[PDB]
Amino acid sequence: LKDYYAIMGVKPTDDLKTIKTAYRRLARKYHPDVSKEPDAEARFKEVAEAWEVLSDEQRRAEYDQMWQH
Amino acid sequence: GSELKDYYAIMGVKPTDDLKTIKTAYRRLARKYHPDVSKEPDAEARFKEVAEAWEVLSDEQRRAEYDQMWQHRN
Amino acid sequence: ATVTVTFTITELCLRTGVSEEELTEIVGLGMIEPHQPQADTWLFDDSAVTIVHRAVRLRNELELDWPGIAVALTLLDENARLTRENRLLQQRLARFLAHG
Amino acid sequence: ATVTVTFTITELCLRTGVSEEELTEIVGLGMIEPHQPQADTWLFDDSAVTIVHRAVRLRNELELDWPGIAVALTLLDENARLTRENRLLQQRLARFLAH
Numbered sequence: 001l002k003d004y005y006a007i008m009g010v011k012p013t014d015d016l017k018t019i020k021t022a023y024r025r026l027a028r029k030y031h032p033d034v035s036k037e038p039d040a041e042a043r044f045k046e047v048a049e050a051w052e053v054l055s056d057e058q059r060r061a062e063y064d065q066m067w068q069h
Numbered sequence: 070g071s072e073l074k075d076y077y078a079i080m081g082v083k084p085t086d087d088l089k090t091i092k093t094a095y096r097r098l099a100r101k102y103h104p105d106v107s108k109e110p111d112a113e114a115r116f117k118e119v120a121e122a123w124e125v126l127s128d129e130q131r132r133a134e135y136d137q138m139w140q141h142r143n
Numbered sequence: 144a145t146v147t148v149t150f151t152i153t154e155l156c157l158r159t160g161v162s163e164e165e166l167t168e169i170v171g172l173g174m175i176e177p178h179q180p181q182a183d184t185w186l187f188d189d190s191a192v193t194i195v196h197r198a199v200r201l202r203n204e205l206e207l208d209w210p211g212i213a214v215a216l217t218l219l220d221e222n223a224r225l226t227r228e229n230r231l232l233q234q235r236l237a238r239f240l241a242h243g
Numbered sequence: 244a245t246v247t248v249t250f251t252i253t254e255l256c257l258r259t260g261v262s263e264e265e266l267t268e269i270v271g272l273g274m275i276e277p278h279q280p281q282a283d284t285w286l287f288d289d290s291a292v293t294i295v296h297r298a299v300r301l302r303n304e305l306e307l308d309w310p311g312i313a314v315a316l317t318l319l320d321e322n323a324r325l326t327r328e329n330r331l332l333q334q335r336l337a338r339f340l341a342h
Binding site for chain 3: 020023027028031033034048
């Protein structure tokens with residue numbers, strides 16, 4: 001199990017607006033067409049996967065459950 | 070002894086267009102004429118004119134005044 | 144089997160997943176153009192569909208509003224063009240240096 | 244031994260004319276960084292002022308919201324890098340032709 005919130009540098013209690021700002025920052029940092037980082041592919045892979053889950057209310061709800069047990 | 074330009078024609082919009090529409094046209098023209106990407110030979114001069122039109126049309130008070138002056142020119 | 148494919152606003156919206164309101168802004172921003180801009184009905188070539196799909200992908204990947212997407216795509220394409228030009232100049236210099 | 248004068252988001256707002264709410268988004272977008280991001284009170288240095296001024300100029304020029312400005316500035320930094328490289332390569336070609 002991955003810590004999606006750590007990957008995105010947000011708190012488990014943050015709202016969608018805050019997580020989206022974080023996605024924007026991290027996509028700018030690590031997107032393959034924008035990044036100058038040596039580990040861009042690896043880091044963007046983890047960020048895009050986390051955002052895929054956290055951006056969706058239902059997906060985020062089940063992830064939260066799954067992380068407690 | 071002054072100048073009065075056709076700001077609506079400069080921005081490619083109609084005198085009746087709302088602010089949202091005019092702002093979209095500004096965005097389009099600024100992207101077209103931006104010095105780092107523009108493939109237009111007169112980009113600097115064209116953008117200057119666009120910025121002048123937008124400076125007026127984005128201000129609802131200035132716009133109202135311009136409309137009155139333009140409409141009634143002889 | 145050459146063909147010309149034409150979409151109405153509604154057909155284009157269905158093909159690309161963008162709303163009619165978003166399509167209006169995308170047109171206003173100069174990202175695509177209908178056959179006749181001031182015609183009473185906008186019609187789009189399928190070349191426009193391709194452009195909208197690309198912009199939709201970038202909107203998803205960077206989460207920018209449409210004006211930011213239009214600009215980002217323009218800069219990406221200019222940078223890609225310069226990158227190609229730089230590679231060409233590097234090759235030309237190598238060719239010159241080989242000639243002596 | 245090296246000293247960097249810092250100041251509040253309120254002072255950052257005063258120096259830039261950008262509201263504290265907007266400055267908070269600009270921080271969130273990673274355009275500027277407070278000295279201690281986790282500290283109860285964010286403090287910034289003069290370089291944050293320089294970055295915000297450049298961003299304001301681009302906002303006036305292109306009328307993008309802050310996320311679009313952040314990306315545009317990054318891509319423009321890349322454009323300038325490629326342009327410097329283009330010029331250096333052109334100079335090397337001239338140097339060859341003149342030898």
